Amino acid sequence: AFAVHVNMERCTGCNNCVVACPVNALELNTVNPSSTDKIYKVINGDAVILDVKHELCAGCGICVDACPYDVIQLSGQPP
Amino acid sequence: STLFPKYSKTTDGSKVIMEQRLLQQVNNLILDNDICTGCGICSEVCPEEAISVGAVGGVRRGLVDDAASIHVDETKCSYCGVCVIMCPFSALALKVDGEERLPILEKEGFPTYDKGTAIDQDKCVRCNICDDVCPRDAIDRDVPLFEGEDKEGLAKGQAVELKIRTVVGQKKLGNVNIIDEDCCTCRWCAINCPTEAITVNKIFEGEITFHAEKCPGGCSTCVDVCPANAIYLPTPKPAKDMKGQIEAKIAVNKDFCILCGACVNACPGEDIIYLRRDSVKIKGKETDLFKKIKEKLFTPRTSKVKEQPSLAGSVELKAVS
Amino acid sequence: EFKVDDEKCTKCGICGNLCEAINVLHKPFSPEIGKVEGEVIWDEAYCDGCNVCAEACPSEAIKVT
Amino acid sequence: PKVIENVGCPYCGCSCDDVRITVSDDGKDILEVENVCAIGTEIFKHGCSKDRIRLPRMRQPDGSMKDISYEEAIDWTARHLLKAKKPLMYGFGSTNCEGQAAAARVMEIAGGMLDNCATICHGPSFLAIFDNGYPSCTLGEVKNRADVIVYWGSNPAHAHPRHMSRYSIFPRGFFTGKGQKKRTVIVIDPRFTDTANVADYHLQVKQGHDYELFNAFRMVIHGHGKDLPDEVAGIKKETILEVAEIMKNARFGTTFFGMGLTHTDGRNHNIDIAISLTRDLNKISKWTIMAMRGHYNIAGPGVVWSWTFGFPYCLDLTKQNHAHMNPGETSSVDMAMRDEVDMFINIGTDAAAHFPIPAVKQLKKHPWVTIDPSINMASEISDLHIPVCICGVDVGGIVYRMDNVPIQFRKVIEPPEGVMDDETLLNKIADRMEELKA
Amino acid sequence: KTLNMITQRAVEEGIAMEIGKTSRQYFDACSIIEMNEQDMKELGIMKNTNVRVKSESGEVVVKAVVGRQTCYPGLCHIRQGVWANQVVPPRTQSTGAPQYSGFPVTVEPVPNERLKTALELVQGAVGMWKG
Ligand SMILES: Nc1nc2c(c(=O)[nH]1)N[C@H]1C(S)=C(S)[C@@H](COP(=O)(O)OP(=O)(O)OC[C@H]3O[C@@H](n4cnc5c(=O)[nH]c(N)nc54)[C@H](O)[C@@H]3O)O[C@H]1N2
Ligand SMILES: Nc1nc2c(c(=O)[nH]1)N[C@H]1C(S)=C(S)[C@@H](COP(=O)(O)OP(=O)(O)OC[C@H]3O[C@@H](n4cnc5c(=O)[nH]c(N)nc54)[C@H](O)[C@@H]3O)O[C@H]1N2
Ligand code: SF4
Ligand code: SF4
Ligand code: SF4
Ligand code: SF4
Ligand code: SF4
Ligand code: SF4
Ligand code: SF4
Ligand code: SF4
Ligand code: SF4
Ligand code: SF4
Ligand code: SF4
Ligand SMILES: [Mo]
């Protein structure tokens, strides 16, 4: 239930934070999908986090490790 | 107001030091963030409900800086030291004045874990397998280093007691032990020891199941955070060998799983993992507090997506009936 | 000359820790197999007829000539 | 608020077609664009502009630039194309495949030199394809099967942004359900690029020594790799052996290359040693080279002129009944150097900006015509600037992806009242030339 | 000093051109040297200061910065565009691909000199610089 922050100023729209998030990958890549909500979607060229109320993230670091030009900061402390 | 109950929480390098000042008496709950494994056996056990669990996967992978695996509300902590006794990999220590001091053990008010380690030195042969397979750095083998990788400990020819002919019996140069406060009872070293000379017994008993058909693929957080490296990504078969069975996405080795719980705390999935412990193995008699702690540790649990926002910044699992 | 018996070898380093000819590579440990498995590599450029490592092996896995 | 699905982003070789546009109520303003990268977002934001060129514009004696009618511009271009002796038409990187067919017809009538951005970009690669072949694959193949991925001399993070998230690394395919975590990504280039950040290996090679690197790899593959020197091209022999072992054990590999190979010493020999390496690896594994084509339809001129004249680029259409091709002799830059031209036509490119300035100086001695939708350097040093529709925003058509798979682009905005598209324009030029009876 | 050099891409550069080749965004994105920190110290180049990149086939005054994409000691880099092609040598080696990456160049710290805009560069190379 952590909080992710995306630096819009250096986001290129690469979409490798959307493809690599394992909560996004739940809908289409799971047998009998449990939850179909998504943290990121690239609207107007930058990654927007729809997870406003910080309910779905799990601090995995797959998205921080994925962005090619580090731009996603993961906060492990309560918002 | 009044100042002297000074509550402080400082991140001194890799140790998160949580402190309570007085004029002359202090209290230091020190968490070593290089050894924590993200299990919650410190949050389930806290009598005073202060320790919460944080971004296990990120911290255990190095992608998080402003947090540790666990957050302790040092205003609520009571410095009992139950967390220090009940943490399987000793990554929490209590220092009262300046020394590691556990009053509850000094008075025998709490049982401790019976990891039960031992290496019958009349059977071990100074092999190198047990140090090699150990997931944690807990095998202290004290052996002179022969020509392999270094200058001779005695000599290649003195690694074997030879009269210069025939060998005289047995060689066994040195001594090998297991740092009992670091072993997590994974049993990689007992299962793989050549001469069956290692005696370790798992602290927890139960069963863990992996519903592979619910893993969303590229999320090897469970693999990355498992302390005892029980988890694996089942290797994809080659062509002309797949035989219509495609592959599994994740699985576990029940021989090495120690029922810690880091996998469950780290998985971002919904219910891929099912964890349930049935019996903790202790020495020391018992307590009503310990019965409560058994009841808390033995409730089955599994992952969850979309937990409540009011507790944002921590983990909440699913209670399985 | 040299010959190991992979049938009766446990991949214990006590054979490659002695001679500078025997280098024992343990390929990475994975719970897949749950076992230790590697290879023993012997080079001519360093041997001798010392034969100490024959009986230093816990098992009788090594015969040399 | 009229959401339009399945649009095409007209910039990089990826030809991404998973773009969603929310066009305004009147169908002429783009409000929000989803699923596209920034470079693309800006293309659409520019296409939906309110203040854009609508009529041609001529250079008067005073040096200013005043508008003229389309028929007058067509007359000008037709008369000049016929009066010239060896005109050169260059560009075609950013146009539909009907735009690259109409141009072929126009210059068939004229008799000049017809050429595209292949010469200055991946034409050295084609010259290697001619030597050794092109063992390749479509991109869904690497999406659904690839176990090892090599980015040799390329930089997808900044060249093709959503290449990694669409085709190569992160997608979870069919036989690659585990996603990234079972893909081994090797990136080779002297810099520590963002692709190398995402990668798992990195072979930081001295710039220019890729031929020696490839030869080392191929000796390893052919089996007696012990004869390698201590280090090769700055890469250390043990790392070479590591990557080579991974490549051998790959279930299905794929190599991508770019300017690191096509713009350095031994332009085409780097590419053909790479192709030789791929053909050698297919002895024990499955490996497929693949070129990181730049513009959307830059593989469009290749195929269209392949079916029309048999030659992808550097076309010598002066004999009027048999064409010739020799890149060292018929290419735009070499002809500009040896002042072998008489007229330069800027169609779907920016020659002034992206050519060497000695070549631009040599070319400007002659008349200069630009057919672009918007102002750029060529349209600022040209003699007349004919507007044209933008592919994928004002006009649809076929485009050709990196791997020669035809994507069908859609139209989202109607072009400004008056502006025509290149196929109509080139056809009108050809009709007028035939009217002038040559 | 010989200081081998390459010319390559960047997303900010692509973004800039699609904003427009004559825009302040394009100026800022392309007029850039991305060299090594060790080389900057050894030459004597203050970070973020104009510098004279002079190869055998031209010359250009370009801002000198340090790039995240770590160039090893002895490498330079300009994002491709007007400024880089003011200095790219035209040699093709009978292939039609000019030496776009890997040509020697000397670098001279020359602050207090302005940068030349894209229009000024091209229209002055041709001889059309009205403004
Ligand atoms: N220093 C350096 N310079 C280089 C290179 C390098 O590596 N280093 N690489 C060289 C290579 S790889 C090439 S590709 C060039 C690339 O450079 P270019 O091929 O010139 O690419 P753009 O400048 O983006 O050209 C886009 C122009 O075409 C217009 N356009 C878009 N759609 C259409 C259409 O449908 N019809 C028409 N008629 N016009 C349209 C666009 O508005 C724009 O004016 O860079 C080259 N220059
Ligand atoms: N934002 C933006 N995107 C673009 C373009 C653009 O101009 N701007 N251009 C488009 C077009 S026209 C092109 S052709 C494509 C091509 O783009 P790419 O083919 O992917 O190549 P580059 O982006 O120039 O980066 C090439 C990499 O090779 C490295 N390199 C340089 N020399 C060597 C060498 O000698 N050996 C090795 N192993 N590596 C070397 C370079 O450091 C660089 O890391 O991008 C397209 N995408
Ligand atoms: S940390 Fe994991 S779950 Fe959270 S947004 Fe990133 S990839 Fe998704
Ligand atoms: S991966 Fe990074 S650059 Fe790409 S969209 Fe996500 S935040 Fe932006
Ligand atoms: S119980 Fe687990 S989480 Fe708590 S301190 Fe010990 S290792 Fe860390
Ligand atoms: S010392 Fe006791 S009260 Fe404090 S965190 Fe540990 S278990 Fe909880
Ligand atoms: S694995 Fe067993 S025999 Fe080998 S060193 Fe360890 S205790 Fe001794
Ligand atoms: S039980 Fe596991 S952690 Fe303990 S000594 Fe053996 S291998 Fe190491
Ligand atoms: S497999 Fe066992 S030891 Fe590993 S994380 Fe899961 S419960 Fe813990
Ligand atoms: S079990 Fe959890 S950590 Fe492992 S792959 Fe599935 S979602 Fe990811
Ligand atoms: S030869 Fe003997 S000591 Fe050496 S690896 Fe084999 S079994 Fe172990
Ligand atoms: S015979 Fe002696 S010298 Fe040869 S490998 Fe064995 S121990 Fe080493
Ligand atoms: S990668 Fe290229 S085609 Fe795809 S959205 Fe980005 S700019 Fe457009
Ligand atoms: Mo290109």
Automatic annotation (TrEMBL), chain A:
[4Fe-4S] cluster 1 binds at C11, C14, C17, C67. The keyword Metal-binding applies. One of its GO terms (molecular function) is metal ion binding. Its EC number is 1.2.99.5. Keywords: 4Fe-4S, Iron, Iron-sulfur, Metal-binding, Oxidoreductase. [4Fe-4S] cluster 2 binds at C21, C57, C60, C63. It comes from the Archaea. Residues 2-31, 48-77 form the 4Fe-4S ferredoxin-type domain. The keyword Iron-sulfur applies. This is Formylmethanofuran dehydrogenase, subunit G. The chain holds residues 63 to 141 of 146 of the full protein.
UniProtKB/TrEMBL annotation, chain C:
[4Fe-4S] cluster 6 binds at C19, C47, C50, C53. [4Fe-4S] cluster 5 binds at C9, C12, C15, C57. It comes from the Archaea. Residues 1-30, 38-65 form the 4Fe-4S ferredoxin-type domain. This is Formylmethanofuran dehydrogenase, subunit F. It comes from Methanospirillum hungatei JF-1 (strain ATCC 27890 / DSM 864 / NBRC 100397 / JF-1). The chain holds residues 166 to 230 of 388 of the full protein.
From TrEMBL, chain D:
The keyword Ribonucleoprotein does not apply. It catalyses: N-formylmethanofuran + 2 oxidized [2Fe-2S]-[ferredoxin] + H2O = methanofuran + 2 reduced [2Fe-2S]-[ferredoxin] + CO2 + H(+). It is an enzyme of class 1 (oxidoreductase). Residues 52-226 form the Molybdopterin oxidoreductase domain. It comes from the Archaea. GO terms for biological process: methanogenesis, from carbon dioxide; respiratory electron transport chain. Its EC number is 1.2.7.12. Pfam families: Molybdopterin (PF00384). One of its GO terms (cellular component) is membrane. GO terms for molecular function: formylmethanofuran dehydrogenase activity; NADH dehydrogenase activity. Catalyzes the reversible oxidation of CO(2) and methanofuran (MFR) to N-formylmethanofuran (CHO-MFR). This enzyme is oxygen-labile. Belongs to the FwdB family. This is formylmethanofuran dehydrogenase subunit B.
TrEMBL record, chain E:
This is Formylmethanofuran dehydrogenase, subunit D. The keyword Cell wall biogenesis/degradation does not apply. It comes from the Archaea. Transmembrane segments: none annotated. GO terms for molecular function: molybdopterin cofactor binding; oxidoreductase activity. It comes from Methanospirillum hungatei JF-1 (strain ATCC 27890 / DSM 864 / NBRC 100397 / JF-1). Gene3D superfamilies: 2.40.40.20. Pfam families: Molydop_binding (PF01568). Its EC number is 1.2.99.5. InterPro entries: Asp_de-COase-like_dom_sf, MoPterin_dinucl-bd_dom. Keywords: Oxidoreductase. Residues 5-102 form the Molybdopterin dinucleotide-binding domain. The keyword Oxidoreductase applies.
